[PDB]
Design an enzyme around this catalytic site. Structure first.
Site, PDB file in Angstrom:
ATOM      1  N   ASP A 127      17.172 -60.812 -50.182  1.00  0.00           N
ATOM      2  CA  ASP A 127      17.254 -60.530 -48.751  1.00  0.00           C
ATOM      3  C   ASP A 127      17.026 -61.708 -47.776  1.00  0.00           C
ATOM      4  OD1 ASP A 127      17.369 -59.008 -46.416  1.00  0.00           O
ATOM      5  OD2 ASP A 127      15.359 -58.121 -46.683  1.00  0.00           O
ATOM      6  N   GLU A 161      18.101 -61.445 -38.299  1.00  0.00           N
ATOM      7  CA  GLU A 161      18.562 -60.117 -38.667  1.00  0.00           C
ATOM      8  C   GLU A 161      17.327 -59.218 -38.764  1.00  0.00           C
ATOM      9  OE1 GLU A 161      17.570 -58.494 -41.501  1.00  0.00           O
ATOM     10  OE2 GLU A 161      19.050 -56.947 -41.871  1.00  0.00           O
ATOM     11  N   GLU A 162      16.252 -59.765 -39.337  1.00  0.00           N
ATOM     12  CA  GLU A 162      15.007 -59.026 -39.528  1.00  0.00           C
ATOM     13  C   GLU A 162      14.193 -58.816 -38.256  1.00  0.00           C
ATOM     14  OE1 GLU A 162      14.642 -57.572 -42.216  1.00  0.00           O
ATOM     15  OE2 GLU A 162      14.867 -58.825 -44.002  1.00  0.00           O
ATOM     16  N   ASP A 208      24.423 -58.134 -48.348  1.00  0.00           N
ATOM     17  CA  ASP A 208      22.996 -57.989 -48.066  1.00  0.00           C
ATOM     18  C   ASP A 208      22.249 -57.334 -49.241  1.00  0.00           C
ATOM     19  OD1 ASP A 208      20.623 -58.140 -46.701  1.00  0.00           O
ATOM     20  OD2 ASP A 208      21.171 -56.797 -45.062  1.00  0.00           O
ATOM     21  N   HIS A 290      11.535 -55.903 -49.169  1.00  0.00           N
ATOM     22  CA  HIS A 290      10.482 -56.236 -48.204  1.00  0.00           C
ATOM     23  C   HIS A 290       9.107 -56.280 -48.831  1.00  0.00           C
ATOM     24  CE1 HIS A 290      12.927 -55.199 -44.334  1.00  0.00           C
ATOM     25  NE2 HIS A 290      13.516 -56.086 -45.113  1.00  0.00           N
TER      26      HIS A 290
HETATM   27 ZN   LIG Z   1      15.204 -57.319 -45.047  1.00  0.00          ZN
END
Ligand SMILES: [Zn+2]
Length: 321
Positions: A127, A161-162, A208, A290
């Site tokens: 990620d 993006e996060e 992704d 995550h």
């Molecule tokens: Zn992520």
């Protein structure tokens, strides 16, 4: 008023034969990608961090050394965040800038912000360090064929993006929400009266959360479903030709099944503006999602190798190369 923006609705791929397929399979090197494109990216790289800068340098450098005439642009901007105004930098690598249509591959190169915990650092291997490397490996592997390039190729590496905290409408998708709006208000090709860069986006292939074992990618959108089918066909043929590693059709990656819900990601700002999207994100997400365990050690090498082959064939066929 030219109907060129409609050309994408009818674009057909130029299918490679067995012989060409073996060539593409042999032309990509998972070990070379692993050492030269991936490992330098396995570092803390949240927006504004030294890592963000280093990652950005690495990506530009790996592209610049290639023979194809890649034009690199750094789209930098400020944006409000839970921690106040911050600076972000999207990386855009384009072949044939004035080309009306472009097939676009994208991913985010930032890593989610996490304070250090027990001397462990979050590096988001799947990620999305791996997707970044896959795009770089594709650029390297197809370099000679891309050198021959009104439909070309473009690579977008999104920043921010996060979310800085947990996902929220205003805290996430910084780079993509910004680039989508920018491209939508940018006439294309240069001098156009009423078409934008978005009208030029044939298809947005967003990679992704790739790198974990047994990924299952669902067919999210009907207006890109025929291209999802192409990926299935490709996976099926590379497999039948014995060009994939530790792979079975029962455990195929591109399965025959839709997915109703919405998944927040960099494609949203584009999709909501009419851009066709092929979202290559697995469902379910990698178990390490995550988590500090989303590292190099938990990556599945042959799976990434298989996907590079599938993706490179997809791109060549789309581009008629
Ligand atoms: Zn992520």
């Amino acid at each position: 008023a030219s109907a060129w923006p409609e050309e994408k609705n009818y674009h057909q791929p130029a299918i490679l034969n067995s012989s060409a397929l073996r060539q593409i399979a042999e032309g990509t090197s998972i070990s070379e990608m692993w050492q030269n494109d991936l490992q330098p990216l396995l570092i803390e790289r949240y927006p504004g961090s030294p890592g963000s800068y280093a990652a950005r340098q690495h990506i530009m450098q790996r592209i610049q050394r290639l023979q194809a005439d890649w034009v690199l642009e750094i789209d930098t901007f400020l944006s409000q965040t839970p921690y106040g105004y911050r600076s972000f930098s999207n990386i855009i690598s384009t072949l044939n800038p004035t080309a009306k249509r472009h097939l676009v591959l994208a991913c985010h190169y930032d890593s989610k912000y996490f304070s250090h915990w027990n001397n462990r650092v979050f590096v988001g291997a799947t990620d999305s360090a791996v997707p970044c490397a896959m795009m770089l490996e594709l650029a390297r592997a197809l370099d000679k064929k891309l050198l021959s390039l009104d439909l070309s190729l473009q690579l977008i590496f999104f920043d921010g993006e996060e979310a800085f905290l947990h996902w929220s409408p205003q805290d996430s998708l910084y780079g993509s929400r910004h680039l989508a709006a920018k491209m939508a208000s940018t006439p294309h090709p240069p001098g156009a009266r009423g078409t934008s860069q978005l009208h030029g986006m044939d298809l947005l292939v967003l990679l992704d959360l790739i790198g974990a074992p047994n990924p299952t990618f669902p067919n999210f959108f009907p207006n890109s479903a025929r291209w999802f089918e192409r990926l299935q066909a490709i996976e099926h043929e590379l497999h039948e030709l014995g060009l994939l590693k530790d792979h079975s059709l029962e455990g195929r990656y591109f399965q025959n099944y839709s997915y109703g819900g919405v998944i927040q990601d960099d494609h949203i700002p584009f999709l909501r503006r009419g851009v066709p999207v092929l979202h290559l994100i697995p469902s379910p997400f990698p178990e390490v999602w995550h988590t500090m365990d989303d590292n190099e050690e938990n990556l599945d090498e042959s799976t990434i190798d298989n996907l590079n082959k599938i993706l490179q064939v997809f791109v060549l066929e789309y581009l008629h190369l």
